[PDB]
């Protein structure tokens, strides 16, 4: 699988040795090239995963993530074109290195064949993002933003490490294939429930879980524009991809003690969606809506119904995209006005009509309107939950109450309505914003026509 | 500022028959009523000490509010109607004229030439209109939301641009 | 009760300044200078066909407007769906399902000609 790994490793000499003017022209022109190279990984067998080597392998679950990450990397490049034009060239090369290194650690992480190799490359991603969030951030609190990020993720990461080595000494291998074939029932002993607690709370923290979610509002809001998309789009989803992987040996204790988490997600998803409708900062909305959708997929894995694993993958990519346009859009209002208050800028179609067109179709994508894979994945979660419990619908049905209650709400107060006559700052839309808008939303309608590949391994 | 009987009963008489015409619909009925409220309104325009003048006024508002047509008639173009703020969707500021594309700038040359001299008289008269306004401004800033005129020679009436360059009420 | 002279000249100075704005806002007689476009020749022949305004010529042109509307917004569309279902979709079994028609006594099936059992006598109701 070094088809994709090495050219990204080499991309660091590429950007570092590139000339003064190109750099970003260089950075994109080859990151797109790597994207179609990673588009090859769409070749799955039925159920036997693509085992490329002893340490690297991929399956129907990992591959959609790989294409998401690799194709994402050009997007923050062009997204960061505006924000970081003033800075000198050397840090420009360093910033791209952080982006490439981040995507580098992502692709190996999703493709590791040994659990600890996944873990070492799991939390290896906070190191570059901590640099991105803290150094290149904009507002003052960004200092405390990074601390909240790493400490939250680490507070659960270390228990996983102690658990992982324990399984190594107990079973003899943490490799996905061996642990899957030699999967054994995790008994109900108090020792084993804490083992389950160790192997789950790590992903739950950066899931996030209701109550264990403060980092995203304190990080995504003050993260740099490029950094903000990457966190929500994919760096949310390491825990998820790990979660469906480690859940092969935690049975049957999962069906017995997932209730507190199924609780905290269900109430949290309504709670997060409701508070999402009542923030004064637009950037907090995509952050709070993100966890609301993200709280949904934790429900999927807990019931571990085949249908639940169906929508877990689809919603992951769907939301992972969905947060991307909104953060891109929410960015576009910011630097134009140097504020993230939706109240300050209202009715932008009277000034930016094309931006509004992109705004609404991303919004209705967040609405989970079929045939978009946002709904079908999200819908499969509903069906699995009903199989788990018929009553489940009402609490989550309350989530199909708040989403559109806010997901069109900023539309009618950011892109829709009248304009304040004092902001002459608002200007025409540079084609970059619409162009990246095109590569952002056009895919989601494209693979909508063909949902089986991003459906997941349960096909 | 504060409202006095004259300002307030003129406010009263506006709404009162707005309910009455909406109550009667047909002109002639409301016609006889509207002109008899007029006599009913002047039937006491000689009252003694202002306490009664206020107290009878209190009786006027209460019977007005429960005599207020629950579904009154509102002209659409005015606040509360169908055409209220209807054309704000077509409302667009004047600074979008500046960022016009040069190829498109040469497709409307005369109109961009006129905006050039319109923004020209904006700039050459802005500084004189404001400096005169501050010197004639009483201490403590403005004491009311008033505006001094171009009272002197060769000047523009201060703070005129936006209200002169206000978008037309039918931007269509 | 009483426009102060201050605000009297304010309105009037505001009035004709905005009136002069609209006076300067008129669409110019020059408008619009348009660089050359592309004028297709078949539509040139088609519009030139009906300039004289005879009732038959105008009807034929709108009939041709309907005609090309048939060929490539109706007639080509029925072609490519016809090619789609009975040649590709029905090439796949059970894609197109058909309820058997309500075959009725006295009728003959095209192959066997069997007269589906002729209806027996009636209890003879009439009004």
């Amino acid at each position: 699988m070094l088809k994709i790994i090495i050219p990204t490793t080499m991309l660091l000499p590429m950007t570092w040795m590139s000339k003064h003017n190109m750099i970003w022209i260089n950075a994109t022109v080859h990151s797109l090239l790597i994207s179609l190279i990673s588009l090859s990984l769409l070749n799955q067998l039925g159920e036997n995963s693509l085992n490329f080597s002893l340490t690297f392998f991929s399956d129907s679950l990992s591959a959609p993530l790989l294409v998401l990450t690799t194709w994402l990397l050009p997007l923050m490049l062009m997204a960061s074109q505006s924000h970081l034009s003033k800075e000198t060239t050397t840090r420009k090369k360093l910033y791209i290195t952080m982006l490439i290194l981040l995507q580098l650690f992502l692709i190996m992480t999703f493709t590791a064949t040994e659990l600890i190799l996944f873990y070492i490359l799991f939390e290896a991603t906070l190191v570059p993002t901590l640099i991105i969030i803290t150094r290149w951030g904009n507002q003052t609190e960004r200092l405390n933003a990074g601390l909240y990020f790493l400490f939250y993720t680490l507070a659960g990461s270390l228990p996983l490490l102690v658990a992982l080595v324990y399984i190594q000494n107990t079973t003899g291998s943490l490799n996905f294939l061996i642990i899957h074939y030699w999967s054994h029932p995790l008994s109900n002993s108090w020792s084993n429930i804490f083992m389950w607690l160790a192997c789950i709370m790590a992903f739950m923290v950066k899931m996030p879980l209701y109550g264990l979610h403060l980092w995203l509002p304190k990080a995504h809001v003050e993260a740099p524009i490029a950094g903000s998309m990457v966190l929500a789009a994919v760096l949310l989803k390491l825990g998820g991809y790990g979660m469906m992987r480690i859940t092969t040996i935690l049975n049957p204790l999962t069906n017995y003690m997932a209730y507190p988490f199924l609780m905290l997600s269900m109430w949290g998803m309504i709670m997060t969606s409701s508070i999402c409708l009542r923030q004064t900062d637009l950037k907090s909305l995509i952050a709070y809506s993100s966890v609301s959708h993200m709280a949904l997929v934790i429900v999927a894995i807990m019931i571990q119904t085949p249908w639940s694993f169906m929508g877990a993958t689809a919603l992951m990519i769907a939301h992972g995209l969905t947060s991307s346009m909104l953060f891109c859009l929410a960015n576009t209002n910011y630097e134009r006005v140097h504020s993230r208050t939706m109240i300050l800028a209202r009715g932008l179609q009277t000034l930016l009509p094309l931006m509004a067109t992109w705004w609404l179709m991303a919004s209705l994508t967040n609405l989970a309107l079929p045939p978009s894979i946002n709904l079908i994945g999200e819908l499969f979660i509903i069906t699995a939950s009903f199989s788990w419990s018929n009553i489940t619908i009402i609490l989550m049905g309350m989530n199909m109450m708040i989403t559109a209650l806010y997901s069109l709400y900023m539309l009618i107060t950011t892109q829709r309505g009248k304009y304040t006559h004092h902001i002459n700052n608002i200007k025409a839309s540079f084609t970059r914003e619409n162009a990246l808008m095109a590569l952002h939303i056009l895919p989601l309608l494209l693979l909508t026509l063909n949902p089986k590949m991003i459906l997941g391994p349960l096909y | 500022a504060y409202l006095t009987h004259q300002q307030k009963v003129l406010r009263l008489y506006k709404r009162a028959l707005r309910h009455l015409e909406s109550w009667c619909v047909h002109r002639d009925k409301y016609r006889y009523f509207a002109c008899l409220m007029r006599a009913r309104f002047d039937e006491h325009k000689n009252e003694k000490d202002m306490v009664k003048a206020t107290q009878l006024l209190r009786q006027a508002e209460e019977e007005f509010w429960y005599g207020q047509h629950p579904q009154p008639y509102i002209f659409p173009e005015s606040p509360g109607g169908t055409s209220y703020e209807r054309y704000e969707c077509y409302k667009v500021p004047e600074w979008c004229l500046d960022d016009w594309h040069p190829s498109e700038k040469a497709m409307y040359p005369d109109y961009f030439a006129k905006r050039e001299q319109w923004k020209r008289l904006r700039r050459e008269s802005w500084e004189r209109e404001v400096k005169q306004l501050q010197e004639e401004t009483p201490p403590g800033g403005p004491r009311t939301e008033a505006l001094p005129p171009a009272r002197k020679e060769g000047d523009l009436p201060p703070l005129w641009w936006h209200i002169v360059t206000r978008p037309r009420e039918r931007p269509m | 009760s009483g426009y102060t002279p201050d605000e009297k000249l304010r309105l009037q100075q505001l009035r004709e300044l905005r009136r002069r704005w609209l006076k300067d806002q008129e669409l110019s007689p020059r408008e619009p200078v348009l660089p050359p476009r592309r004028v297709w020749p078949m539509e040139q022949f088609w519009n030139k066909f009906l300039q004289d305004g005879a009732p038959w010529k105008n009807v034929i042109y709108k009939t041709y407007r309907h005609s090309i509307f048939a060929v490539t917004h109706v007639l080509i569309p029925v072609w490519i769906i016809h090619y789609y279902l009975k040649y590709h979709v029905t090439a796949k079994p059970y894609t197109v399902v058909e309820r058997k028609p309500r075959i009725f006594p006295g009728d003959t099936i095209l192959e066997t000609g069997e007269v589906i059992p002729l209806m027996k006598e009636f209890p003879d109701q009439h009004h």
Binding site: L352, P353 | W100, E104 | -
Partner: peptide
Amino acid sequence: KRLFIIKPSGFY
């Protein structure tokens, strides 16, 4: 007589 209607710059 016909007045002028202003729009956002569109060519971009």
